Amino acid sequence: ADALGMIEVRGFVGMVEAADAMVKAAKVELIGYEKTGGGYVTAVVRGDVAAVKAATEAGQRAAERVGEVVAVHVIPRPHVNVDAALPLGRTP
Amino acid sequence: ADALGMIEVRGFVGMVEAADAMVKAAKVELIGYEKTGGGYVTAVVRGDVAAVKAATEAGQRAAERVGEVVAVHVIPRPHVNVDAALPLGRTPGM
Amino acid sequence: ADALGMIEVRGFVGMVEAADAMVKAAKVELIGYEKTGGGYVTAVVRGDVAAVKAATEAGQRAAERVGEVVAVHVIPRPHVNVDAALPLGRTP
Amino acid sequence: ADALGMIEVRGFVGMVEAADAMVKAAKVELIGYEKTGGGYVTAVVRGDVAAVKAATEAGQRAAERVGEVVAVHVIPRPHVNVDAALPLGRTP
Amino acid sequence: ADALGMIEVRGFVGMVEAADAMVKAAKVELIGYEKTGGGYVTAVVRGDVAAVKAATEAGQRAAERVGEVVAVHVIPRPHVNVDAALPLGRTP
Amino acid sequence: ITLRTYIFLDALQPQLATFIGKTARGFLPVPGQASLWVEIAPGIAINRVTDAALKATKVQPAVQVVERAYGLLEVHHFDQGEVLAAGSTILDKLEVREEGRLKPQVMTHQIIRAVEAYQTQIINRNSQGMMILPGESLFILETQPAGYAVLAANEAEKAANVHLVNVTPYGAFGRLYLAGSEAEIDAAAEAAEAAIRSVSGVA
Amino acid sequence: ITLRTYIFLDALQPQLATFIGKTARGFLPVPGQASLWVEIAPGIAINRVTDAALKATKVQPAVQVVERAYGLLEVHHFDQGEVLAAGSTILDKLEVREEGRLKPQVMTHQIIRAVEAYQTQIINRNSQGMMILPGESLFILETQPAGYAVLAANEAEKAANVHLVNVTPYGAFGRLYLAGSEAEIDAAAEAAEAAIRSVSGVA
Amino acid sequence: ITLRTYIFLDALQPQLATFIGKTARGFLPVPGQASLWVEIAPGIAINRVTDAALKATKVQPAVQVVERAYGLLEVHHFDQGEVLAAGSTILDKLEVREEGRLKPQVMTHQIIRAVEAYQTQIINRNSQGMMILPGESLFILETQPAGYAVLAANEAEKAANVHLVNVTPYGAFGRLYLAGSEAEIDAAAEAAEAAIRSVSGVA
Amino acid sequence: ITLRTYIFLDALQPQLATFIGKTARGFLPVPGQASLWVEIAPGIAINRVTDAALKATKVQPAVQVVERAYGLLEVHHFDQGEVLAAGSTILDKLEVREEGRLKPQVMTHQIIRAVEAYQTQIINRNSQGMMILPGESLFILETQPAGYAVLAANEAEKAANVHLVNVTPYGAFGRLYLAGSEAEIDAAAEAAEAAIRSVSGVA
Amino acid sequence: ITLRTYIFLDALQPQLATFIGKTARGFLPVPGQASLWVEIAPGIAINRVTDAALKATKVQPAVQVVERAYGLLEVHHFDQGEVLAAGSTILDKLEVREEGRLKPQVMTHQIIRAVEAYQTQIINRNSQGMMILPGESLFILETQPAGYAVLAANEAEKAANVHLVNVTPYGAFGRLYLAGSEAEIDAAAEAAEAAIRSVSGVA
Amino acid sequence: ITLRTYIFLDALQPQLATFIGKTARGFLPVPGQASLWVEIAPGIAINRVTDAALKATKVQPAVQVVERAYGLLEVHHFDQGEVLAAGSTILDKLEVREEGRLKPQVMTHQIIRAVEAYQTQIINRNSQGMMILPGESLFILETQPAGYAVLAANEAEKAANVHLVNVTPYGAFGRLYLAGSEAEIDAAAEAAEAAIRSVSGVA
User: Fold this and answer.
1) F133 touches chain G (CB under 8 A)
2) The domain that contains G13 carries what CATH number?
3) What beta strand segments (E) does chain B contain?
4) Domain BMC, which positions (chains A, C, D, E)?
5) Rounded to whole angstroms, how far apart are CA atoms C52 and C77?
6) Which domain holds residue G97?
7) Residues ≥6 apart with Cβ < 8 Å to B29
8) Do H55 and G116 lie within an 8 Å CB cutoff?
9) Among partner residues F121, F126, F140, which is closest to J48 by beta-carbon distance?
C-alpha cells in the first residue's frame, strides 16, 4: 500500500545520482532498478505518499544536471495486482 | 482531525467518476454527497492530508473529461465545531 | 438575541471554506446552513458583534479565492421577531 | 467594566431618536437619561465595547439629522470610582 | 486636608471623560458632581496635592478634545471652613 | 514616535500560549482568547503605550522586555472587542492610522525535508518550543520587522497539523521554524508566506 | 563506588534522543544508537569510571554529572556489541557484577485527566522536552533511585506517538512526564510501570 | 503527603506583590488581592494539590515549585469569598484541619543596623527585590517551614514604609529580608515577632 | 580610534553604587568617591585604554564587560585628582581634547503617572534595580550615545527623593528608568534632561 | 544568498577544540581534525546550508546557533577530503565561486605588556578560555567580518607558545584576546595580524 | 555555631587570584595580596560574621555564598597584620581560638594521566579556571572541610608550574582540579598534601 516513485534516465550515472538524491530527501526505501536496455534505466522507490512526491521532485532536480532524464512519475496507492506481478519490491 | 477534500460539479455524472477516481487514487473514505439544487453536487472525502491532496487532483483530472467542474478544494484541519453541524461523515454523536 | 453573520455562495464548497475560516478566527457558533435552491447555500454564524465582524472578514477573504461570493452581512441585534420565525438556531 | 456610550443633545427629541437608534443597532442597555438644565440632556448606554462603538456612531448619524448634537463619546472601562458616584446604571 | 481639583464643563459628556481620565491618571478620589444648571457641570476630585495637579492637567488635555471646557483649577490646602459648608466630599 | 507592527490576533490556536508563555515572564495569555502585539523602537515608548491600553481597557500583558534589543508589547484578552479598543487607542497616542505600518518583506522561505539525525539535536539547543523529531521536515521564514512573525505562527497551526518549533517577534528580523510530517509542512508554510504579503502598509 | 543503577538501552528511540540531546553537553547521541548508562555512588568516583572506559573503547560520552552523592554516566555508539565490554569492565573496576545493582522501585504513578491550562503555563515553563498543549493527558512516574527513569521514557515513545515533556535521571527520584491524548497516555503509563518490575537488583 | 503550612494573608501588600511577581514564572499577581499560600510535602504531591484546587475554583495559579522534598502551590485572587471554598477544597482533600497544619517556629532573628558601604556591595547583589543601599538598616528574620515567610513580610510592610530587599519562601526555611531606617525597622521587627508568635498550628 | 562619550562624575550619590555595583562584576565602586566615563568601540580599545589609565594612576575599574555589544570603560577612586589624572592620559592616548565628544541627542523622555498595578510587576522582570511600587509614577529617558545615562541617573537622585530603577550606558542608545512619588519625578526629570543639554560637544 | 566568510581549517591545534567545543553546544570538535567556516546573512540560510553538507558528506557540526546575532556554520571531521567536499557544496548551494568572499578589514591590532594586576582578573569575567595571569601580556585584534578570527586564532598558537583567551567568530566584528609571556605574543601576533591580509577577496 | 575553617594566606598566588574573579560577585581580589577566608555554619551568622570583621578591620568581602547550612565569606587585605585582625577578631568572636577549626584529612586523591578527549570535553565545561587541553594530565583532589581547599591552589602554583582547571570551596567537600604535564602535577600532590597534612585544628 506504500506509494511508488520512479525515475527513468538514459544514463546509468543519471539514475544513480537520481537514486541517491531521493533517499537523501525523505523517508523512502530504494528497492532496486530495472534496466530496460538501450541505455534506458529506471530507479524505483516506495514509501509514504507525500515523501515519494517530495523525493521524486527532488531527484529530478539532481538528475537533470548530469543526464538525459526521460520520465518522472509517482503512483500513490497502486493496485494489489501491480505489486503482485511486477518487480516493485512490495511483492509477498 | 481527518482532512477534507471536495469536488463540486454541475452534473451528477461528473461527481461519481470524480468519487470513483478519488478512492482508487489514495486511502480516503467517500462519505457521501450534497445536492444544492440547480444541478450542483459535491463529493466529500476524508483521510490523510497527503492522500486527499493526491486524490483531489486525481478527481479533477478525471471529472474534467466529462462535466464542468465548479470548485475543487482541500482542507487539512477542519475545525472541531464544523464537523458537528455540517454533513461531512465525521459528525460525532453515536 | 446574540448577533448574526452570514455568507452565501452559489457553490457548496465556498460555504464550507468560509464556514471553516470564520470558526477558526473567533469565538462564534456555527449553527448550520440553509439551502435556497439553485446552487445558493448560506452559512450562519452567531455570537458577539466583534466576533462576527472579524469572522466574516476572514470568511469573505477565504471564499473569494474559490467561489462566486454573493453577499456578506452582519446584524448586531436581530429584533426578537426574526429569530422566532426564521431558523437561525437561537429559536425557542 | 461594562463600557459606556453617551450622546448630549440640546433638545429632547434628538436624544430619543439617538437612543432608539442605538438600542436597535446593537446589544446595549439604555439605562436612563440626565437633564443638566439649560436644555441639555444626555443619553447613557452600557454594554460591550463592540456594540457601543457600533451603537453610538449609529445613533449620532441618526440624531444629527434632527437637532444640535453637542458631543459623542465612548469609554471602554469607566474606572470603578466613576460607576460608583455617577448615575451611569451600575452604582452598587 | 486633602487637596482639591475641579473641572467645569458645559457638556455632561465632557465631564465624564474628563473625570475618568483623572481617576485613571493619579491616586485621586472622585467625590461626585454638582450641576449648577444651564448645562454647566463640574467634576470634583480630591487627594494628595500633586496627584490632583497631574490628574487635572490630564483631564483638561482629555476634555478639551470633546467638550467646551470652561475652568480648570486646583486648591492645594483648602480651609477647614470650606469643606464644612460646601459639598466637596470631605465634609465631617 | 514611529510604528513597526500593528497585528490584531483573532483567536489563537492552542499551542501558542506555551511558546508564548515559556518565552514570556509576565501575564501569560491562554489559548482561545485574543491578544495584541506591538514592537517599536525605542523600547520605552512601548512602556508609555502600555498604559493607554491598560488604563482604557480590561486587558493583560505578558511581554514587556528588552532582553533582545528594544522592547516589545503584548496584551491579551478573551473578548475581541475589548482588545480592539486597546489597539485603536495605542495608535491614537501615536496619531497614526493603520496603513502607517511597514509592508512586510518575504526574504527567505524554503522547505527542508528529512533533516539528518544530527541537526535535530542542535536546533533543540534553541529549546524555546517543541523539538524537531529526527527526519520530519522544517520550514524557514524571514520578515522585516520582527513582530509580524507571531501572526504567521498563529495562522500556521490554524491551517495545518504542525508541531511548533520556535518563533521570533524578537530581534531585528522575524524568523520562523516549523516541524511535522511532510504534507502538513507544505500546507502550513504555504499558508504563512501568503499571509505575510496581504498586509497593507508603506515600504 | 557503589553501583546504584545501570540499564543499557538497546537503541535510543526517535524522540528521547532529542530530549537527551537537548540537555547533553558532551559527545552527543544520535537516533538509533545503542546506549548504556551506569549510575553509582559516590558521585566523586564516577570521574574514574568514564575516564578508564573512554581510554579502552570508542564509545561516546553524552552526560557525566557529579553530584553530592550519586553519579551518572552515559555512553553512546552505533555498535551495540561494544557496550558489553566497557560495562563489564567498569563493574569489574568497582568490584561488582550484574546482580550487584540496585533494583528499581516504582515510587508513584498518577494520570491526571485533562491537564488544566494554568498548570500548562507552569508545566512547560520548567520543561525542556515538548511543550504541553492544553487538553492532553500527562502521565508522571517516579523511580527510586533516580537513574531508572531513562528506561521509562524509552518505553513510552516506542509504543505510541506520545510527547516527552521532561526527563532528569540525576537526583534522588527520576521524573518521566509524557503527554498526549487520554487514551494514548493510558497505554504509555502502563509500559512505564512494568519496566520497574523487570529491572534486576536488590532493594 | 504531609501538609506543612497554610497561612492566608488578608491582603497581599504593595511591595510583596511585585517581589513575589519579580521571581514567579506563572500567572503574575496584582496589588490588593487577598491570597492564600499552602505548603505541603512531598514535592510530587503539589501537582495533585493544585490540580485539585485549580479544577475546583476560579482562582489564579501563580507558583508551583519542586523543592528538594516538598512542593508548594499558592493561589491568589481578589475575591475574598474564594478563599473559604478553595481552601476547604484543597485542605479537606489532603489530610489537614486548619489547626492540623504545622505551627511555624522562628528559627533565627538578627538585626544589623546601618549597613556599611562594603556590605551594600555584597548584600542585595544576591537579591531581586529592592536594592539595599549603603547606610540603611537591615533586620533579618527566618520562618520554618519556608512558606510561612509571607505572613512575616506582609505584616511588617503593611505597617510601615519600609523597603523589601529580598524574600524567598521556597526551600527548607524561608528568608524574609527588610531594609529601612532605624525607627521604621524598630516597630516592624516588633510587629514581625508577635505576628509569627500568634500563628496557630502543630509541631 | 573614534570618540563618543567623555563623562566626568564628581562624587556619586549613595544608591547608585548599589545598582552600579550589584549590576557590575568588577571593582565595584562605593558611595562618596569619584568615577570616570568615556565611550569607544571596539571593546578591546577600551582594554588598552584601561591600562594607560591604571598604570598612570591609583584608580580601580568597575565596568569592563561585553554583555551588551562592545565594552565600555569606567574607573573609580575617592580622590577627584587621581580620576582627573586617569582621564588626562586616556584622551591624550587618543590625542583629542574634551570638546571633540559628540553632542548628545535626547531621544525619548516622558513622565508616566499612576502606573497600573499590572505594569509595575512586569517592568521589574528586568530587576536590575528597584521596583516601581503599584501606582506611583515613572520617568524614562533615551539618549545617544549610551554612556551618558549614568551621569543623568546621578544628578536625578542627587536632586530629588527618588527610587532608582534601571540604567543603560550599554547599547546603541542610552535608556533610563526612574520611580517614586509624583512631584519629585518632575524635579528629577527637570534636572536630568538639563544635565544632558548643558554638556558641550560637537554634532 | 550573500557571502561573507569562507574558512577551511586544515588540522586544528590542540587547545582550540577545547575552547571551540567547551564554548559550543553542538557536536564538539576534537584536536587534529578539519573544519569549515562560512558566514552568510541572513542567519537562517546557515540552518539550511548545514544539511546540504550533512546530506552529501560524512561530517559533523559544532557551531549552529543564533544566541549572538545571526548564525554561523562550522562542520568538522578528521579526513581533510570530506570537509573540502562539504565546502564545495555549500558555496555551490549559493551558485557562487570561491573568490566571492569579502577581503577582511583589520581595525585594531596592538600588543600590551605586563598588564596591571587589576585588568587581568576582570577579563576572566568573560571566561570563555584561559586567563591572563597578572603581568603577562595581551594581544587584541579586530577584523570584519567575525568568522575569520578562528583562522587567525589558529595560526597564532600554531606558531608560538601562547595561551588563548576569548574568541568571537560571532557578531558583526571579530575580536581576539591572547595571553602569555612576552616574546611569544610578539611571535604570535606577528603571525596573526599577518594571517588576515594574506586572504584573497572582493572589495 | 561551629567554626569549620579559618585560614589566612600569606600571599595569594598569581593564577588562583584570577579564579576568584571568575567566580566572585563582590569586590574582586588582586594579585600578591594576602587573603583570609572564613566558613562557618549556620550561614545566618555570616552576615553578622562579616559585619564583625568589616567593622573591626579593613578587610574586603570577595565572595559570600549562602548554602543549605554553611556559609563562606572571604577577606583580603595587603597588610598581613590587618587581615589577621579581622581573622583574630572573627576567630575570637565566637569565644573560640585557633584549635576550633576543623582538622584536615585527605578526603580523595586520584591522578588520571593523559586526560582523554571524552573527559576533556566534560572537564572544563564544568570548570571556571584554566581549560584542560587534550593530552595534559589532570589530578582531581577533594578536601574536607571545603574551606581548607585554598591551601591546595596556593601551594601548587607557587611551588609548581601547574594549571588550575577548577576550584570551588563552597559546599560540603571542596573540589580541586589541576591540569598540566606529567612531571609538574606529580610534585604538587606532594606539596598539596604536606600543607593539608600540616593543617592544624580539631575535629
Assistant:
1) yes
2) 3.30.70.1710
3) 4-10, 28-35, 40-47, 69-75
4) 3-87
5) 12
6) 3-102
7) B23, B45, B46, B47, B89
8) yes
9) F140
User: Is the Cβ of F116 closer than 8 Å to some Cβ of chain G?
Assistant: no
Nearest chain E CA: its distance from I116 CA (Å) = 9
Contact J42 F108 (CB under 8 A): yes
Same domain, H84 and H98: yes
Rounded to the nearest 10 degrees, how much is the dihedral formed by the CA atoms of J52, J53, J58, J62? -130
Q: Are J194 and J141 in contact (CB under 8 A)?
A: no
Closest residue on chain F to G32 (Cα): F117
CB burial readout G19-49, b (16+ within 10 A) else e: bbbbbbbbbbbbbebbbbbbbbbbbbbbbbb
C-alpha cell at H86: 478553595
Instruction: Indicate the resolution in Å.
Output: 3.5
- Beta strands of G78-195 (E only): which ranges? 105-112, 137-144, 163-168, 174-180
Give the domain-ending residue among H73, H102, H131: H102
Of I53, I77, I102, the one marking the end of a domain is I102
Q: Indicate yes or no: CB of D76 within 8 angstroms of CB of F80.
A: no
User: Subunits touching K (CB < 8 Å, at least 3 pairs)?
Assistant: G, H, I, J
- Contacts with B, A 40-59, CB within 8 Å: 48-50, 53
Q: Do H107 and H95 share a structural domain?
A: no
CB contact at 8 A, G181 and G136: yes
F2 by Cβ neighbours in 10 Å (0-12 / 13-18 / 19+) ranks as exposed
Asked if B54's CB is within 8 angstroms of A53's CB, the reply is yes
Please judge whether E27 and I183 are an interchain contact, meaning their C-beta atoms are less than 8 angstroms apart: no
- Could you tell me which residues come within 8 angstroms of residue I116 by beta carbon, excluding any fewer than 6 positions away? F51, F54, F55, I135
Residues H125 and H93 in one domain: no
I105-113 and I137-144 as β-strands: parallel, antiparallel, unpaired?
antiparallel
| Claim to verify: residue F96 and residue F130 sit in the same structural domain | no
Query: Which residue, among I68, I122, I128, would best test binding to F if mutated, counting the most F CBs under 10 Å from its CB?
Result: I122
Residues 134-153 of F with CB under 8 A from G: 134-135
Q: How many helices (H) and strands (E) does chain C have?
A: 3, 4
Nearest CA-CA partner of H163 in H136, H193, H187, H142? H136
> Would an 8 Å CB–CB cutoff place K54 in contact with chain I?
no
Count: domains in chain K: 2
**Domain locations in chain C as residue ranges:** 1-84
Whether residues J138 and I47 touch (CB distance < 8 A) is answered with yes
Crossing angle for the helix pair F148-157 and F16-23, to the nearest 10 degrees: 150
Burial of A80 (0-12, 13-18, 19+ CB in 10 A): exposed
J74 and J109 housed in the same domain:
no
Cell triple for residue H65? 515549585
> Between A and B, how many CB-CB pairs are < 8 A?
22
User: Residues of H67-87 as b/e, b for ≥16 C-beta within 10 angstroms?
Assistant: beebbbbbbbbeeeebbeebb
Same domain? For H194 and H112 the reply is yes
The values of phi and psi at residue G65, to 5°, are -115, 125
CB of I48 less than 8 A from some CB of K:
no
Nearest chain I Cα to F55, which residue? I116
Task: Give the rounded distance of the alpha carbon of G7 from its chain centre.
Answer: 9
**Contact predicate A45/A28, CB 8 Å:** yes
Other Cβ atoms less than 10 A from the Cβ of B80: the count is 11
* Calpha distance I159→J129 (Å, rounded): 44
User: Do H97 and H111 reside in the same domain of the chain?
Assistant: no
Q: By the CB < 8 Å criterion, does J26 face chain G?
A: yes
Could you say which residues from 19 to 38 on chain D have a Cβ atom under 8 Å away from some Cβ of chain F?
none
Same domain, K97 and K109: no
Instruction: List chain A residues with CB under 8 Å of B50.
Output: 48-50, 53
| Best CATH choice for the domain C1-84 from the list 3.30.565.10, 3.40.50.2300, 3.40.50.1820, 3.30.70.1710 | 3.30.70.1710
